[PDB]
Amino acid sequence: LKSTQAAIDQINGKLNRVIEKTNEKFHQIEKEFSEVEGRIQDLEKYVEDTKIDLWSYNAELLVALENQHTIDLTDSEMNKLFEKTRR
Amino acid sequence: LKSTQAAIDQINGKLNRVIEKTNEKFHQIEKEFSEVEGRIQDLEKYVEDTKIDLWSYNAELLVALENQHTIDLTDSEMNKLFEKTRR
Amino acid sequence: LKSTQAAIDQINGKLNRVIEKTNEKFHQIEKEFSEVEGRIQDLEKYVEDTKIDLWSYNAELLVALENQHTIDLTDSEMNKLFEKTRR
Amino acid sequence: HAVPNGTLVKTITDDQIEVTNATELVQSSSTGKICNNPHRILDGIDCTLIDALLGDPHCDVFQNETWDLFVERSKAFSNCYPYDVPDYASLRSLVASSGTLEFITEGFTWTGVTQNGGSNACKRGPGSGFFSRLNWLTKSGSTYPVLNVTMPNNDNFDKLYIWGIHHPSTNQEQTSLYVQASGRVTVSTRRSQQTIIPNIGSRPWVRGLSSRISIYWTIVKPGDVLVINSNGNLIAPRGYFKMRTGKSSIMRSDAPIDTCISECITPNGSIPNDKPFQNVNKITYGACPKYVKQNTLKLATGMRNVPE
Amino acid sequence: HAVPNGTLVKTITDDQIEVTNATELVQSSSTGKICNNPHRILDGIDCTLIDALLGDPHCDVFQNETWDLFVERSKAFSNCYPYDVPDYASLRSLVASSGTLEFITEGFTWTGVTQNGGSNACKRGPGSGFFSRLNWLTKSGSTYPVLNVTMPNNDNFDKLYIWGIHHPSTNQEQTSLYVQASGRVTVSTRRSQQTIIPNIGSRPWVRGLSSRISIYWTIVKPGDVLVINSNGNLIAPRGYFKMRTGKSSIMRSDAPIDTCISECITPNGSIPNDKPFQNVNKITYGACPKYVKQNTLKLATGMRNVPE
Amino acid sequence: HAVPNGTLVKTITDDQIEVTNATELVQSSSTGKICNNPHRILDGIDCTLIDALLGDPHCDVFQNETWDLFVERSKAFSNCYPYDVPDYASLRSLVASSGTLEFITEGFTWTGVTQNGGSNACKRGPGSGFFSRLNWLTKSGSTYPVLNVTMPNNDNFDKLYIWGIHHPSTNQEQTSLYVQASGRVTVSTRRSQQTIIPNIGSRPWVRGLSSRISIYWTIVKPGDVLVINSNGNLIAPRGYFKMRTGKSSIMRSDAPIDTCISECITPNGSIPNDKPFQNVNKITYGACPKYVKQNTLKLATGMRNVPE
Ligand SMILES: *[C@@H]1O[C@H](CO)[C@@H](O[C@@H]2O[C@H](CO)[C@@H](O[C@@H]3O[C@H](CO)[C@@H](O)[C@H](O)[C@@H]3O)[C@H](O)[C@H]2NC(C)=O)[C@H](O)[C@H]1NC(C)=O
Ligand SMILES: *[C@@H]1O[C@H](CO)[C@@H](O[C@@H]2O[C@H](CO)[C@@H](O[C@@H]3O[C@H](CO)[C@@H](O)[C@H](O)[C@@H]3O)[C@H](O)[C@H]2NC(C)=O)[C@H](O)[C@H]1NC(C)=O
Ligand SMILES: *[C@@H]1O[C@H](CO)[C@@H](O[C@@H]2O[C@H](CO)[C@@H](O[C@@H]3O[C@H](CO)[C@@H](O)[C@H](O)[C@@H]3O)[C@H](O)[C@H]2NC(C)=O)[C@H](O)[C@H]1NC(C)=O
Ligand SMILES: *[C@@H]1O[C@H](CO)[C@@H](O[C@@H]2O[C@H](CO)[C@@H](O)[C@H](O)[C@H]2NC(C)=O)[C@H](O)[C@H]1NC(C)=O
Ligand SMILES: *[C@@H]1O[C@H](CO)[C@@H](O[C@@H]2O[C@H](CO)[C@@H](O)[C@H](O)[C@H]2NC(C)=O)[C@H](O)[C@H]1NC(C)=O
Ligand SMILES: *[C@@H]1O[C@H](CO)[C@@H](O[C@@H]2O[C@H](CO)[C@@H](O)[C@H](O)[C@H]2NC(C)=O)[C@H](O)[C@H]1NC(C)=O
Ligand SMILES: *[C@@H]1O[C@H](CO)[C@@H](O)[C@H](O)[C@H]1NC(C)=O
Ligand SMILES: *[C@@H]1O[C@H](CO)[C@@H](O)[C@H](O)[C@H]1NC(C)=O
Ligand SMILES: *[C@@H]1O[C@H](CO)[C@@H](O)[C@H](O)[C@H]1NC(C)=O
Ligand SMILES: *[C@@H]1O[C@H](CO)[C@@H](O)[C@H](O)[C@H]1NC(C)=O
Ligand SMILES: *[C@@H]1O[C@H](CO)[C@@H](O)[C@H](O)[C@H]1NC(C)=O
Ligand SMILES: *[C@@H]1O[C@H](CO)[C@@H](O)[C@H](O)[C@H]1NC(C)=O
């Protein structure tokens, strides 16, 4: 009973933590071109592509690590209860 | 006595580690404009804003993880000592 | 015997995981310049330098964390076996 | 406990571990409809922002309007004098950031020159027409004299002025329209000055005409003075536009409008913002979550499922 | 267990911890040789891409060729009319992204003007020569009449056109070469138009000549029409180039060629891509790992070495 | 152990956990004063770098000076001929990166033209004056002949040359100052050439004058030759500047100077660099820590405080 509510507190804190807004934008760079303009097109597309790739990376390890911590806690309490049952 | 000096070694290594200089700049892009110039202003401001945001993010998880490790060690030794006291 | 094959599974999964390709580029921004052109040179060099620095940072913590997890597991099983030997 | 059906999730330890429950934080799709609450949505069905500013005859309904997010349908098209917008994106984003169409008329003096010129390519009804916010200046009788108009700014805000330079097709057209063999128009403020000279030449015949118009804009600050000098080929403004500061943007879309109340608008419709990540699109408006490239970010919400 | 020789690695806990084994994921160096499998490698030994496009006499061998990664040796040099490439990087990257040299001739009509002009600075053999893809237009007898060549696009792909504007050294040279005292050349499509006027003046004497040529390019879409107007100092194309979409790039290198099958090519040679990181270079081609600034990224592959 | 007063810190587990001790790594503020050790600080109180380079009469004290970090007070202002710096930031950062004012004179030959022109708008004392590093060339008697001056570079370093092009107000002013109805000035090296033509017109009357000057700069490499050609409206240099490579920058500030020894300088004063992060400003100079947006980064330095 204690483990269930404890893990619930864990994931619910994790949830209401990670769902935060840290992004605020009104108007950005042009993501879409109709013709070929020159070097400025390269600058624009490259910076925005690097931005989206880096954000995807950030997200990737965010979920990776949080899931890892959830594993560590759940399997830790799992072996603990297995020990106390196999005294 | 051993736990106190051990934890001291921990945080002091962590400190003299994270305080490293990895940034070296002499002259950078213009962060301040007096009038409206055009698309180049968008390029400049966007790249520098993305840079500062990404650096703040990096810092965020740096402190997050290091604090997490300090927790893991301190509460681990806490339950260990509670166990050895409640034999 | 079980610990050796377990740790082998650990590092081999870690390896075949981290070696993934997530980068695909055909043509990029011009890093080299022969003369001084103006502000566009600043934009170009700054964005690419920030990119390489951020990628190096990403790599840094990747190896840092993975090595950390390998430590945690190996020293955990180390104290476990020391305990079972010093009953 | 244990369940006969677990959920597989990605980890760093093993690529797919089975737990008892998980969640699907990533928003997967949109409803398809955009809807206008609490935002003020104005539908530019067949005319974009610039055509609304110039005053095209087929979109004279959109006048003195405000909005929170202007939309641009792919079916937009122009029905007036052919033109070109030098550095179009800058002025588009500038006018899009304001969000208003408060056009305040101004009394101008055009001596010796004939105003209100029109062409059959911009028929506002049964007869020839022109733009509503612009005035075509022409010669009167036997000459086109030099013009030096001045307008001050005694207010406490900024003013937007639009003007145009006419590029004829032939030198005979120029001479018959302006006695001067060559044209020149200078806009000037106390800190910003520009000069434009027309270009006689043949252009791709669009709507049955080769002559062109080039539009330019100017911003006047409080206490600044705007001076216009001309000797031929000038399209003068009829007033100015008041500048504001607010949360106004633009988004090209083709989705229909509904009556939902929602703070997140995307070109593919609306989505709820009760989630941290979404994979519908990167281009969002208002309070919208992080954009990623992964639609299957699963979050383990239960213990490891070890069935009996 | 324990071993008498461990491996020191970097950590966040302590700067150097000793474990029983480690790995060296970072690729340290290259073999020095670049090799052409499964990629199609073409060696531009002494002429770069632009000289291959213009048709220099010393590189007439490279004609109607395709490639996957063009190389540019530092020993490249030109042996023809001096020139300048306005915005050189854009056109270089554009032609480099195509990867083909399919040049399709086109029938042009040049009335009243003398074609196929040459100079001793571009001798293609024993006599005077010129570029293979360009034609020098000159006056015939006593006049250089105005030109207006039109060419449509009835196909379903894009066409590339190259042209040049001649800058003479003296006004007498201009008048003797073109009766018109001043030149002007206008290229036009249904959406893109440009106009160039020559510049009479003295330039640094290169290969014994002060006159210059400026090259420009144009892209024609399906259904579009290309119109050329001229009155003097025009170098006309002899055809067009078909545009494609593929994985084609360029890389300046000086390494020799081998026969190894490898998907990763670097300017310093080839490297295997069986590793996640490398420190040879940032500029890579094909499937190549992440670039970093650290060559000593060690990964602990064993337990902590605690010797007896 | 336990203490009655703990410290609350942010975690990922719980938002605020209480431990026995913590630290405040972030630097919170500055002392307000900038001070000049071990750096060489030069105070440009009322004249910026460009005015120090041109040689304004009110800042003739700053001559042949070196520095490590130049400061620009907001009270700076010019007291000479009105001007414009085309692409000002580039030349500002270029001269700021050098850090020296070693001006080496050069012997020039100006045939048929009158040198050392001045105006009452730049009075260096009781009489009319001009810039110290520039020379105003004018006609002599009845003509302004063409000038073709040449200067080589036999040294092993780079040279900086400054020059100016005069824009008159009226055509009569141009003709009376230079007999040529139109002007043209060409700067040339073996690889870089530029040409400027003056612009006759009216400008905002500043300090009682409408005429203008446009400044340009040129870099000469070892073995290169600088050629200047002119026919009117040229402001010639009197020498050159030697280029160096070092750690020199600029920073606009209004803080007073002190005698501290410190390696970190900010526009709001100096700060110690014994910490990994600071929140004073992002624009720093020298060894200064990481910039962040959070001023409350607490680091737990003790066990969890569980009072009795
Ligand atoms: C040089 O050649 C070009 C291309 O042929 C000529 O441009 C073409 O000029 C004709 C003139 O009749 C255009 O026809 C007109 O089209 C408009 C479309 O709005 C129509 O309203 C008129 O009634 C007429 O049909 C044609 O569109 C135009 N473009 C093309 C691709 O043909 C150009 O005039 C020639 N210049 C000369 C004569 O030197
Ligand atoms: C204005 O000043 C420039 C700068 O020197 C003069 O340019 C120079 O012109 C001479 C032409 O006699 C070039 O000399 C050439 O040398 C080669 C090699 O011996 C020779 O074969 C040619 O016949 C010629 O003599 C000289 O290289 C060139 N200087 C530069 C910078 O390249 C220019 O001539 C001057 N204007 C006048 C009045 O000539
Ligand atoms: C077209 O109208 C504009 C706005 O009225 C004119 O600009 C202003 O012209 C007057 C007369 O030239 C300038 O007054 C000047 O003051 C200076 C300084 O005392 C004096 O040296 C001049 O002789 C003259 O009295 C006024 O400053 C100027 N606007 C500014 C700069 O604020 C413009 O001149 C008119 N068109 C012409 C004549 O080009
Ligand atoms: C959100 O709106 C965009 C706007 O079109 C939708 O776009 C595209 O999605 C299709 C489906 O794979 C792709 O083929 C196109 O290339 C996309 N257009 C782009 C990237 O410009 C998108 O599908 C919408 N989101 C959802 C979840 O439907
Ligand atoms: C990969 O190719 C590059 C291309 O030259 C090699 O380049 C340089 O390395 C030397 C050795 O320190 C430096 O002095 C140069 O400054 C480098 N040139 C640059 C950065 O443009 C590089 O050495 C090659 N990689 C390896 C592992 O040899
Ligand atoms: C460091 O110097 C800067 C330079 O002015 C100081 O600047 C500003 O801080 C005030 C206080 O909130 C803001 O209102 C301004 O907008 C800031 N100016 C900017 C961002 O350009 C700053 O306060 C100084 N640091 C400290 C700790 O005082
Ligand atoms: C999958 O899980 C659901 C939810 O309990 C269950 O009803 C269903 O029988 C399961 N299916 C299988 C094949 O286990
Ligand atoms: C699994 O979690 C979701 C919320 O993430 C919840 O709605 C659902 O009831 C859970 N499953 C069970 C069997 O309780
Ligand atoms: C280093 O390790 C190797 C590998 O076992 C071993 O042969 C060698 O003797 C060791 N050297 C020292 C000095 O420990
Ligand atoms: C150490 O690891 C490498 C692979 O990373 C392996 O080839 C080597 O055999 C290992 N060392 C020993 C002593 O097994
Ligand atoms: C806060 O901590 C200080 C440091 O020991 C102590 O002197 C003080 O009494 C504490 N205050 C409270 C309200 O606990
Ligand atoms: C808390 O840590 C600081 C250094 O971070 C130290 O100066 C202080 O003495 C510590 N507090 C106590 C009660 O020891």
Side-chain angles (χ1 to χ4, degrees):
Chain A
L1 303 176
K2 66 188 148 138
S3 54
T4 76
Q5 56 86 15
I8 281 178
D9 304 328
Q10 275 63 97
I11 303 301
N12 284 346
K14 289 299 143 167
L15 166 74
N16 55 59
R17 181 52 162 78
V18 295
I19 61 175
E20 56 181 27
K21 308 320 202 224
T22 55
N23 187 347
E24 284 90 5
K25 297 162 191 164
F26 51 96
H27 162 65
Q28 304 157 70
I29 294 169
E30 297 303 313
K31 163 159 129 189
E32 293 177 350
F33 301 86
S34 52
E35 299 290 335
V36 193
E37 294 179 349
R39 298 166 65 176
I40 54 175
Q41 190 155 333
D42 289 345
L43 322 173
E44 292 188 43
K45 296 195 291 183
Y46 206 86
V47 299
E48 183 178 2
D49 271 86
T50 50
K51 173 174 183 164
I52 68 173
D53 272 42
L54 295 174
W55 279 118
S56 45
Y57 175 88
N58 308 319
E60 288 230 347
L61 295 174
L62 293 161
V63 175
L65 177 63
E66 183 178 2
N67 207 53
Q68 273 278 57
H69 193 327
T70 63
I71 299 151
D72 304 289
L73 62 95
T74 192
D75 77 307
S76 55
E77 293 177 350
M78 199 69 54
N79 289 337
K80 164 200 66 52
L81 63 90
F82 281 160
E83 293 177 350
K84 65 185 66 189
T85 49
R86 199 57 70 90
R87 49 96 173 176
Chain B
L1 303 176
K2 66 188 148 138
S3 54
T4 76
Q5 56 86 15
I8 281 178
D9 304 328
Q10 275 63 97
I11 294 169
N12 284 346
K14 289 299 143 167
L15 166 74
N16 55 60
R17 181 52 162 78
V18 295
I19 186 167
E20 56 181 27
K21 308 320 202 224
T22 55
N23 187 347
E24 284 90 5
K25 297 162 191 164
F26 51 97
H27 162 65
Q28 304 157 70
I29 294 169
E30 297 303 313
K31 6 214 125 282
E32 293 177 350
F33 301 86
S34 52
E35 299 290 335
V36 193
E37 294 179 349
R39 298 166 65 176
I40 54 175
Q41 190 155 333
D42 289 345
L43 322 173
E44 292 188 43
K45 296 195 291 183
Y46 206 86
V47 299
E48 183 178 2
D49 271 86
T50 50
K51 173 174 183 164
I52 68 173
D53 272 42
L54 295 174
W55 279 118
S56 45
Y57 175 88
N58 308 319
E60 288 230 347
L61 295 174
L62 293 161
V63 175
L65 177 63
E66 183 178 2
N67 289 337
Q68 273 278 57
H69 193 327
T70 63
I71 299 151
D72 304 289
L73 62 95
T74 192
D75 77 307
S76 55
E77 293 177 350
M78 199 69 54
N79 289 337
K80 164 200 66 52
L81 63 90
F82 281 160
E83 293 177 350
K84 65 185 66 189
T85 49
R86 199 57 70 90
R87 49 96 173 176
Chain C
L1 303 176
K2 66 188 148 138
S3 54
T4 76
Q5 56 86 15
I8 281 178
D9 304 328
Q10 275 63 97
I11 303 301
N12 284 346
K14 289 299 143 167
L15 166 74
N16 55 60
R17 181 52 162 78
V18 295
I19 61 175
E20 56 181 27
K21 308 320 202 224
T22 55
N23 187 347
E24 284 90 5
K25 297 162 191 164
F26 51 96
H27 162 65
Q28 304 157 70
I29 294 169
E30 330 323 320
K31 173 165 35 104
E32 296 60 29
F33 301 86
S34 52
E35 299 290 335
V36 193
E37 294 179 349
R39 293 182 183 174
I40 54 175
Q41 190 155 333
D42 289 345
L43 322 174
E44 292 188 43
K45 296 195 291 183
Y46 206 86
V47 299
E48 183 178 2
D49 271 86
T50 50
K51 174 174 183 164
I52 68 173
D53 272 42
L54 295 174
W55 279 118
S56 45
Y57 175 88
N58 308 319
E60 288 230 347
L61 295 174
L62 293 161
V63 175
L65 177 63
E66 183 178 2
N67 207 53
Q68 272 278 57
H69 193 327
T70 63
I71 299 151
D72 304 289
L73 62 95
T74 192
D75 77 307
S76 55
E77 293 177 350
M78 199 69 54
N79 289 337
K80 164 200 66 52
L81 63 90
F82 281 160
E83 293 177 350
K84 65 185 66 189
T85 49
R86 199 57 70 90
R87 49 96 173 176
Chain D
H1 61 83
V3 305
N5 205 356
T7 174
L8 295 174
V9 290
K10 266 185 178 181
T11 75
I12 304 296
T13 59
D14 60 287
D15 200 67
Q16 284 302 306
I17 204 181
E18 183 178 2
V19 300
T20 41
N21 200 9
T23 299
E24 197 304 294
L25 54 92
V26 176
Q27 173 90 24
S28 63
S29 97
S30 64
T31 183
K33 270 74 61 180
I34 55 170
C35 33
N36 49 13
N37 284 128
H39 297 281
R40 175 165 162 84
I41 302 299
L42 266 296
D43 195 4
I45 54 170
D46 68 318
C47 48
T48 173
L49 265 194
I50 65 172
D51 311 329
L53 177 63
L54 316 175
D56 198 284
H58 77 267
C59 280
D60 287 332
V61 175
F62 308 104
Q63 279 207 346
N64 287 14
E65 282 272 8
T66 64
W67 68 92
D68 286 335
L69 172 66
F70 195 83
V71 175
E72 289 187 339
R73 316 288 198 182
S74 45
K75 59 180 176 179
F77 61 106
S78 96
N79 300 317
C80 193
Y81 201 85
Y83 60 94
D84 289 345
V85 190
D87 289 345
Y88 167 78
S90 52
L91 188 54
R92 183 179 181 265
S93 45
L94 192 140
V95 185
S97 44
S98 45
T100 57
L101 295 174
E102 183 179 2
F103 170 74
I104 306 298
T105 59
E106 276 190 342
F108 296 101
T109 301
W110 312 109
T111 59
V113 294
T114 302
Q115 327 169 28
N116 301 319
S119 64
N120 292 318
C122 202
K123 291 179 181 178
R124 186 172 280 102
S128 175
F130 201 62
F131 286 119
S132 81
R133 302 288 183 260
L134 276 300
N135 194 321
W136 193 345
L137 281 299
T138 48
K139 76 182 196 64
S140 314
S142 64
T143 182
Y144 187 94
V146 58
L147 309 180
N148 195 45
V149 104
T150 302
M151 181 69 65
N153 194 337
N154 60 293
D155 300 298
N156 55 271
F157 43 83
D158 299 326
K159 305 176 178 177
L160 298 153
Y161 292 83
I162 314 304
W163 49 287
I165 301 312
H166 167 236
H167 300 291
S169 314
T170 65
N171 49 7
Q172 193 272 334
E173 171 189 358
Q174 163 73 29
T175 54
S176 45
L177 195 55
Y178 309 95
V179 291
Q180 294 300 320
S182 167
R184 168 221 40 80
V185 162
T186 77
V187 64
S188 49
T189 50
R190 282 216 183 96
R191 48 167 190 80
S192 168
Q193 305 84 20
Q194 291 179 356
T195 303
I196 305 294
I197 299 102
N199 295 319
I200 295 95
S202 35
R203 282 87 188 186
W205 291 95
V206 176
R207 281 196 274 259
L209 172 72
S210 64
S211 180
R212 287 300 182 271
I213 185 61
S214 64
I215 294 169
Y216 301 97
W217 84 98
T218 316
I219 299 180
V220 170
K221 299 181 62 182
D224 285 352
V225 175
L226 185 64
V227 193
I228 310 305
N229 188 278
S230 168
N231 57 8
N233 313 80
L234 179 53
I235 311 292
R238 302 184 183 271
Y240 71 91
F241 271 85
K242 294 181 59 184
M243 295 191 58
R244 290 167 169 85
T245 61
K247 317 297 178 296
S248 165
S249 53
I250 204 165
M251 171 197 302
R252 299 179 182 91
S253 287
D254 282 332
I257 317 186
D258 207 9
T259 58
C260 347
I261 313 179
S262 185
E263 181 62 40
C264 190
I265 307 176
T266 63
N268 48 45
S270 315
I271 47 181
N273 45 11
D274 57 335
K275 289 152 193 173
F277 299 91
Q278 90 278 348
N279 192 31
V280 297
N281 199 315
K282 191 218 98 306
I283 306 179
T284 67
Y285 168 69
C288 295
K290 287 308 206 216
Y291 168 77
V292 300
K293 296 187 312 169
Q294 303 87 21
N295 192 31
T296 176
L297 304 179
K298 299 183 174 180
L299 187 142
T301 65
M303 64 165 64
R304 184 194 176 180
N305 187 27
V306 189
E308 293 177 350
Chain E
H1 61 83
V3 304
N5 205 356
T7 174
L8 295 174
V9 290
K10 266 185 178 181
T11 75
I12 304 296
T13 59
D14 60 287
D15 200 67
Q16 284 302 306
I17 204 181
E18 183 178 2
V19 300
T20 41
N21 200 10
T23 299
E24 197 304 294
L25 54 92
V26 176
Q27 173 90 24
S28 63
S29 97
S30 64
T31 183
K33 270 74 62 179
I34 55 170
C35 55
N36 49 12
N37 284 128
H39 297 281
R40 175 165 162 84
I41 302 299
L42 266 296
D43 195 4
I45 54 170
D46 68 318
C47 48
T48 173
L49 265 194
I50 65 172
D51 311 329
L53 177 63
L54 316 175
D56 198 284
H58 77 267
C59 280
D60 287 332
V61 175
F62 308 104
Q63 279 207 346
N64 287 14
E65 282 272 8
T66 64
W67 69 92
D68 286 335
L69 172 66
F70 195 83
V71 175
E72 289 187 339
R73 316 288 198 182
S74 45
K75 59 180 176 179
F77 61 106
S78 96
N79 300 317
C80 193
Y81 201 85
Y83 60 94
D84 289 345
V85 190
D87 289 345
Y88 167 78
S90 52
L91 188 54
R92 183 179 181 265
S93 45
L94 192 140
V95 185
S97 44
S98 45
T100 57
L101 295 174
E102 183 179 2
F103 170 74
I104 306 298
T105 59
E106 276 190 342
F108 295 101
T109 301
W110 312 109
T111 59
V113 294
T114 302
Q115 327 169 28
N116 301 319
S119 64
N120 293 318
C122 202
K123 290 179 181 178
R124 186 172 280 102
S128 175
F130 201 62
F131 286 119
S132 81
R133 302 288 184 259
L134 276 300
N135 194 321
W136 193 345
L137 281 299
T138 48
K139 76 182 196 64
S140 314
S142 64
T143 182
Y144 187 94
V146 58
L147 316 178
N148 195 53
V149 175
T150 302
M151 181 69 65
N153 194 337
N154 60 293
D155 300 298
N156 55 271
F157 43 83
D158 299 326
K159 305 176 178 177
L160 298 153
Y161 292 83
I162 314 304
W163 49 287
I165 301 312
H166 167 236
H167 300 291
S169 314
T170 65
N171 49 7
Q172 193 272 334
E173 171 189 358
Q174 163 73 29
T175 54
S176 45
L177 195 55
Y178 309 95
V179 291
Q180 294 300 320
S182 167
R184 168 221 40 80
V185 162
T186 77
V187 64
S188 49
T189 50
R190 282 216 183 96
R191 48 167 190 80
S192 168
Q193 305 84 20
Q194 291 179 356
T195 303
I196 305 294
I197 299 102
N199 295 319
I200 295 95
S202 35
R203 282 87 188 186
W205 291 95
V206 176
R207 281 195 274 259
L209 172 72
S210 64
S211 180
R212 287 300 182 271
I213 185 61
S214 64
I215 294 169
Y216 301 97
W217 84 98
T218 316
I219 299 180
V220 170
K221 299 181 62 182
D224 285 352
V225 175
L226 185 64
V227 193
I228 310 305
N229 187 278
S230 168
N231 57 8
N233 313 80
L234 179 53
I235 311 292
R238 302 184 183 270
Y240 71 91
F241 271 85
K242 294 181 59 184
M243 295 191 58
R244 290 167 169 85
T245 61
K247 317 297 178 296
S248 165
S249 53
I250 204 165
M251 171 197 302
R252 299 179 182 91
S253 287
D254 282 332
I257 317 186
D258 207 9
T259 58
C260 22
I261 313 179
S262 185
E263 181 62 40
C264 190
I265 307 176
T266 63
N268 48 45
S270 315
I271 47 181
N273 45 11
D274 56 335
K275 289 152 193 173
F277 299 91
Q278 90 278 348
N279 192 31
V280 297
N281 199 315
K282 30 225 312 325
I283 306 179
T284 67
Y285 168 69
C288 295
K290 287 308 206 216
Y291 168 77
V292 300
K293 296 187 312 169
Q294 303 87 21
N295 192 31
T296 176
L297 304 179
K298 299 183 174 180
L299 187 142
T301 65
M303 64 165 64
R304 184 194 176 180
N305 187 27
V306 189
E308 293 177 350
Chain F
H1 61 83
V3 304
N5 205 356
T7 174
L8 295 174
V9 290
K10 266 185 178 181
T11 59
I12 304 296
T13 59
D14 60 287
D15 200 67
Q16 284 302 306
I17 204 181
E18 183 178 2
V19 300
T20 41
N21 200 9
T23 299
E24 197 304 294
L25 54 92
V26 176
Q27 173 90 24
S28 63
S29 64
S30 64
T31 183
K33 270 74 62 180
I34 55 170
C35 33
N36 49 13
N37 284 128
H39 297 281
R40 175 165 162 84
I41 302 299
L42 266 296
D43 195 4
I45 54 170
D46 68 318
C47 48
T48 173
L49 265 194
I50 65 172
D51 311 329
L53 177 63
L54 316 175
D56 198 284
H58 77 267
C59 280
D60 287 332
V61 175
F62 308 104
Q63 279 207 346
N64 287 14
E65 282 272 8
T66 64
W67 68 92
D68 286 335
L69 172 66
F70 195 83
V71 175
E72 289 187 339
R73 316 288 198 182
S74 45
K75 59 180 176 179
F77 61 106
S78 96
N79 300 317
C80 193
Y81 201 85
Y83 60 94
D84 289 345
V85 190
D87 289 345
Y88 167 78
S90 52
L91 188 54
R92 183 179 181 265
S93 45
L94 192 140
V95 185
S97 44
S98 45
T100 57
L101 295 174
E102 183 179 2
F103 170 74
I104 306 298
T105 59
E106 276 190 342
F108 295 101
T109 301
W110 312 109
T111 59
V113 294
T114 302
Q115 327 169 28
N116 301 319
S119 64
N120 292 318
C122 202
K123 291 179 181 178
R124 186 172 280 102
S128 175
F130 201 62
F131 286 119
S132 81
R133 302 288 184 260
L134 276 300
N135 194 321
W136 193 345
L137 281 299
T138 48
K139 76 182 196 64
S140 314
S142 64
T143 182
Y144 187 94
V146 58
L147 309 180
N148 201 67
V149 192
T150 302
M151 181 69 65
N153 194 337
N154 60 293
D155 300 298
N156 55 271
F157 43 83
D158 300 326
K159 305 176 178 177
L160 298 153
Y161 292 83
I162 314 304
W163 49 287
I165 301 312
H166 167 236
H167 300 291
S169 314
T170 65
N171 49 7
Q172 193 272 334
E173 171 189 358
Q174 163 73 29
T175 54
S176 45
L177 195 55
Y178 309 95
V179 291
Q180 294 300 320
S182 167
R184 168 221 40 80
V185 162
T186 77
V187 64
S188 49
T189 50
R190 282 216 183 96
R191 48 167 190 80
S192 168
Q193 305 84 20
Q194 291 179 356
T195 303
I196 305 294
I197 299 102
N199 295 319
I200 295 95
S202 35
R203 282 87 188 186
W205 291 95
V206 176
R207 281 196 274 259
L209 172 72
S210 64
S211 180
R212 288 300 182 272
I213 185 61
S214 64
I215 294 169
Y216 301 97
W217 84 98
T218 316
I219 299 180
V220 170
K221 299 181 62 182
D224 285 352
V225 175
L226 185 64
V227 193
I228 310 305
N229 187 278
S230 168
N231 57 8
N233 313 80
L234 179 53
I235 311 292
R238 302 184 183 271
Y240 71 91
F241 271 85
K242 294 181 59 184
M243 295 191 58
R244 290 167 169 85
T245 61
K247 317 297 178 296
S248 165
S249 53
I250 204 165
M251 171 197 302
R252 299 179 182 91
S253 287
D254 283 332
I257 317 186
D258 207 9
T259 58
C260 347
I261 313 179
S262 185
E263 181 62 40
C264 190
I265 307 176
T266 63
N268 48 45
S270 315
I271 47 181
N273 45 11
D274 57 335
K275 289 152 193 173
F277 299 91
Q278 90 278 348
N279 192 31
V280 297
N281 199 315
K282 55 171 173 293
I283 306 179
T284 67
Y285 168 69
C288 295
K290 287 308 206 216
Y291 168 77
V292 300
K293 296 187 312 169
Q294 303 87 21
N295 192 31
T296 176
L297 304 179
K298 299 183 174 180
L299 187 142
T301 65
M303 64 165 64
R304 184 194 176 180
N305 187 27
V306 189
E308 293 177 350

